[PDB]
Assembly symmetry: C2
Homo-oligomer: 472 residues x 2
């Protein structure tokens, strides 16, 4: 009489990702604001637990490609979806930028984000070092908003159910209002989803709120959602059907429909979901120039290498003739990752390990380390899940003259707001707001250009209706 | 302490659909034989329970568009995959044709199919009338092959778990070597999958072999596969990852990977699966002119109308100006189906009900019934799941002068082989084989043209490598 224990019948919450992660994963975050607003009213009345609509790569995209002010995008969504819990993805001490910042910047950014309407802050760190998440978290609590501590899921010799339960505890210990299990690479299998979700519930209590974010890259995560729901998961993330699958996510409608008769239910307005879906089915074709060309890829389960990392390393060897050695790089990546203490292979970690793998294949084993890689071995990105190869660490120290550190990298950073402020105020177009100063601090190289063109209004790099017909 | 009982740890069998249903669902059965053979050796060594590679719409496609002889395709697959159980889809008394045939034709077709290498015959009837399946089944047993009785899954007021358990019993009663639950529209939800699968096991025994065939049209069937496996399902059908999803099926690799740690396992050679996958990833782009443009559609759960039926009805109103009334037709379909005794909405049933719905919207309620629709109401397609509206039946009788029948439609059919033989032998190109006579009997209108051009060899209607680059 073999049996599985499942959570008591209950309503499961849904977080819609169409406005942020979905298009970031499917069309390089190129989705224009004018192609989104027409769906806000319906999304707002759909019945979602939260609506992910800011953060992640959208800040960069807004200013770099769309000549759009992120803060204006945030203000508009807040206005167009007044009844909803807006959600964002924030990479801890890196905020939405390229480097860790002094705490005062984190304070400023979070504060201005809450001030403009952000309700739920999913804070995460690419290395999974809770220290890098600690200040952002506190900042979110101070603004009286929902702080969601993030655990980046991954598979490696050092990652275990126990290790994740511990990390969860650390997150709760720093005031997490909830825990997000983030599986960007779709590495979370069904059984593991059930065990981890249950392990955390059994350990910290049923009251412990867990939100599961799984991409559908590998094709197995929708089954993992079911198992997570049986393990008692509180909220799962999805993407409206016309903007789903591939490197994207599981379909909202599908996740809602698959529960009928299980005892579990979602409570989303199906007719509203249908409008949201059609809205995007009409719009999506315009972005064909940015679609990925693969729907299902399970290779990562064996290679441990994500595609977005795979193609990139290829473009390096290809644009360097040694495109044949792609098999030697494939074998080198694991070794480099291990040397780095097995960090989750997500941006930036992924790029760093990828590029470094290429070097060891060509110029020889760590004969020359990038500055970024050296910074990882030396601790400037924080602590790794496992201890790093002391030998490779030493080399790094001998190739950069930098001294190893083991404490939160932000502890060494000096106040910078005043400096950033003065510098931003010298740029043509600057409007005086901290918002603008933050844009400059997060993107020194783009802020100037953006500030000068912003008055032109946001644009779109998607095909026009004209262009669509003119092709077909 | 809520709990679910799951089957004992065990190996689950997999049936690969890439060679038949996958391309029929994703690229209108246009897949050229030369684009397939290069994958046979690997598919043969993959470890699948069976390989669906013939039947369904491939016969028609081979002779109508590819100038290819189906029997030659069957002989080649048999040769290229000597170690595998080949499988086919056969629509009962209709064989792979357009009408029910006299038993002697069924005998001839099945016999020649086994003779040329077919091992597993999935026999099914669009109305789910076991009588229409009875003779084909027996014929398969006589050839000493595996007879798989099919239950076309659907949702309707008359379809219940009990109703399916009964149908299963009828299938076993006529010698079924196994039962196939076929969900062409991806209507099978997780709970129902578990209940039905278990209901049949609990009722006829664990020894009862059940094979589940779910399309991924609605996005919920991979979760249903898991539940079916927990309910004890023996074999599930999948499509190699590069030829999956959409109106197609769940990914083979994904289904294999999602089981890790559950106690269940598949035993497929992952490296072989990888070659099969790459083989088709390279080839698939050439068929872009035949792809569907939707990946996930849950609308059918509310409308009860499949897309392939939906678009067709639209092309009727569109090519007739009354494209506005598409909402009136949408409401009429349910009514017509009910009148017909709720048959599963799969070909031919779907087309018949669709077209008839259009008429009632225009010319008025059954003011004019098609001959096909009249035949359904009158019983010439067999028995319906539920009793048909006696009023609509009467009308049919008064608009066709045909008398209602309730017995197996084939009971009225006269011997025809001799007739078909003589007629086929008058065509230029005819080679004398029963195989050819069968081609003529199944496709009177095409056989002549095919026989005349066959010597040219099979062709492809897919883009060429040249054409691909010349576009991109
Ligand atoms: O999928 C995620 O949540 C991770 C993400 O977008 C990012 O790295 O910016
Ligand atoms: O999916 C199925 O098995 C049904 C099918 O192909 C057909 O109607 O020819
Ligand atoms: Co994501
Ligand atoms: Co099918």
């Amino acid at each position: 009489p073999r049996e599985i224990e499942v959570s008591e019948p209950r309503e499961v919450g849904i977080t819609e990702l169409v406005l942020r992660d979905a298009h970031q994963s499917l069309m390089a975050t190129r989705m224009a604001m004018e192609d989104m607003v027409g769906a806000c009213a319906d999304i707002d009345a759909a019945g979602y637990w939260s609506v992910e609509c800011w953060g992640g790569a959208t800040y960069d995209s807004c200013i770099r490609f769309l000549n759009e002010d992120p803060w204006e995008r945030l203000r508009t969504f807040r206005k167009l979806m007044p009844n909803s819990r807006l959600q964002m993805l924030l990479r801890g001490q890196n905020l939405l930028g390229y480097r860790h910042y002094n705490d005062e910047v984190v304070d400023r950014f979070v504060d201005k984000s809450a001030e403009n309407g952000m309700d739920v802050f999913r804070v995460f760190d690419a290395m999974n070092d809770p220290r890098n998440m600690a200040h952002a978290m506190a900042a979110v609590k101070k603004a009286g908003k929902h702080a969601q501590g993030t655990i980046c899921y991954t598979i490696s010799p050092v990652h275990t159910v126990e290790g994740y339960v511990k990390l969860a505890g650390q997150l709760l210990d720093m005031g997490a209002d909830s825990i997000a299990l983030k599986d960007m690479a779709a590495l979370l299998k069904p059984q593991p989803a059930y065990d981890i979700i249950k392990a955390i519930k059994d350990t910290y209590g049923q009251k412990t709120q867990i939100n599961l974010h799984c991409h559908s890259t590998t094709g197995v995560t929708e089954v993992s959602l079911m198992k997570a729901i049986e393990a008692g998961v509180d909220v799962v993330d999805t993407a409206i059907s016309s903007m789903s699958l591939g490197p994207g996510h599981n379909p909202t409608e599908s996740v809602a429909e698959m529960l009928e008769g299980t005892g579990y239910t979602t409570n989303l307005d199906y007719d509203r979901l249908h409008k949201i879906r059609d809205h995007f089915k009409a719009i999506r074709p315009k972005y064909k120039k940015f679609e990925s060309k693969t729907l299902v890829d399970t290779s990562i389960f064996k290679s441990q290498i994500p595609g977005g990392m795979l193609s990139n390393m290829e473009s390096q060897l290809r644009a360097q003739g040694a495109e044949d050695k792609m098999d030697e790089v494939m074998a080198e990546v694991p070794r480099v990752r291990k040397a780095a203490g097995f960090p989750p292979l997500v941006t930036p970690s992924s790029q760093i390990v990828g590029t470094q793998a290429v070097f060891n294949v060509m110029m020889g084993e760590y004969k020359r380390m990038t500055g970024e890689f050296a910074d990882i071995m030396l601790g400037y990105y924080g602590a790794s899940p496992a201890d790093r190869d002391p030998k490779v660490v030493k080399l790094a120290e001998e190739q950069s003259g930098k001294k190893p550190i083991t404490q939160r990298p932000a502890d060494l950073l000096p106040p910078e707001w005043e400096k950033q402020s003065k510098e931003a105020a010298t740029l043509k177009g600057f409007n005086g707001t901290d918002e603008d100063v933050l844009t400059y601090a997060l993107f020194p190289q783009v802020a100037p250009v953006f500030f000068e063109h912003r008055a032109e209004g946001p644009h779109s790099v998607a095909l026009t209706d004209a262009q669509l017909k003119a092709e077909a």
